[PDB]
Design brief:
The complex is a heterodimer of chains A (253) and B (211).
Chain A (H helix, E strand, L loop, with lengths): L2 E5 L2 E3 L5 E8 L6 E9 L3 E8 L6 E3 L8 E5 L4 E6 L8 E11 L26 E4 L3 E5 L8 E5 L10 E11 L5 E4 L9 E2 L3 E2 L5 E10 L8 E7 L4 E7 L13
Parallel strand pairs in A: 2-11
Antiparallel strand pairs in A: 1-3, 3-8, 4-5, 4-9, 5-6, 7-8, 9-10, 9-11, 12-13, 13-17, 14-18, 15-17, 16-17, 18-19
Chain B lengths: L8 E4 L5 E6 L11 E5 L7 E3 L13 E6 L2 E6 L8 E7 L6 E2 L3 E5 L8 E5 L3 H5 L3 E10 L5 E6 L2 E3 L3 E3 L3 E2 L5 E9 L1 H5 L4 E7 L2 E7 L3
Parallel strand pairs in B: 1-9
Antiparallel strand pairs in B: 2-6, 3-4, 3-7, 5-6, 7-8, 7-9, 10-11, 11-16, 12-13, 12-17, 14-16, 15-16, 17-18
The chains are: A mainly beta (253), B mainly beta (211).
PDB class: immune system
Keywords: Fab, HIV-1, V1V2, CAP256, VRC26, immune system
Assembly: dimeric
Amino acid sequence: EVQLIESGGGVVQPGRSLRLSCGASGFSFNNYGMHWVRQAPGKGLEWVAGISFAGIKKYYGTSVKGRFTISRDNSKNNFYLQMNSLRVEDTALYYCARDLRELECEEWTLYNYYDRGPCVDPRGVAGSFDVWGQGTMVTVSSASTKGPSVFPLAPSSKSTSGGTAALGCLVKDYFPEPVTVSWNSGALTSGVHTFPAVLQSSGLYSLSSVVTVPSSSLGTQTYICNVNHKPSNTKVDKKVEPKSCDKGLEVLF
Amino acid sequence: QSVLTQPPSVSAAPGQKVTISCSGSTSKIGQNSVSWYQQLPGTAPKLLIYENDRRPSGTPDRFSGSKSGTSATLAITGLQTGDEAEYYCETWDGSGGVFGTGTKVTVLGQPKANPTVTLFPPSSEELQANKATLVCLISDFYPGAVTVAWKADSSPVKAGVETTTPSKQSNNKYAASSYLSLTPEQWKSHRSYSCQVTHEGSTVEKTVAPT
């Protein structure tokens, strides 16, 4: 069974370096080229680098050329990406992928005139990727553990529609993941949705938790969002009240 | 990050036929072959088409490709539920490695739902922290694909934006979020900011201003 498996991923500070390792199996590794394709989740696919089956030709994307480096060890069915001078914008899920073009070497190095050595075929990749690995995650942040600042997404006339009001909590600037949010100690679960976290250029995560409720209840019912960040050992409780100065929304009391 | 342009999303009912388009520079697609990949949600991509119109031993007759000039096209007949994914076009131009944006193909499994867009201004509390963040929340919509865009006094904004991809809700519909990070100066020194959400050709636009 054909398999590609990556490894080396993890959280790493910018400026530093990191080596990923792709292990190939289920086919003749020394007959195919290899590529690294990354994907900022879920911003789409970006091609990083590629190597010819003999290891003679190296290709690099404009975003990484000069900083990153590729190589392969056919004796180990391995395939490496040496990342240097890491940038916060290098954060992505890194896939290793096999090159489409199957080639048989037709030019080796004979290290002594009695016998063999590395293949040296000058060719030559196709540029199409017919096998993919599971991908290994590479997060780049200079941040250490930090607790969140919780801000209210107050309900207003611009969040109500059809007798259903929308309110939430902005959980800003924390690290690392995760952050679990609840509403009224878990009494309120209907209409609640907590969105995926967002990694800012600052190096910190942010997310929002929103809940939908009867617009008429805003004047009597009380809504507290319960943010929880165990990494920094923090529990914030923010009471969200309707927008202060809003004509377009009537509220009891 | 040089890139080939694709449509954001297309959708059709089980059994119908879809067409997806690529397009780009002549020094890229004008002179080189094109490939197509399928990326089911949560898993790695998978080659569907190579050399413009060749199918690998393992992809059905249903998928087909065709290139002409500076444009390329992927087509899927007899849609099955398991065809729901993102589709990327790609080309190799020597140094090579150029993907599409690309396109999500949704196979409708429920009634289309229009998004309820809610835009929040920065809290005075946050402004006291000499910072500002506009939070645009998109809720209750299907198919689960959108395109958010921010504007300042009806002028495009690109820097300081981060958008999450749509995620399933408890009611099996989708929701998404977008954040525009400002300084309190920018926030107050503009007449209005607006969050423009596009969903199935339709575009909703909410607006907010200082106090």
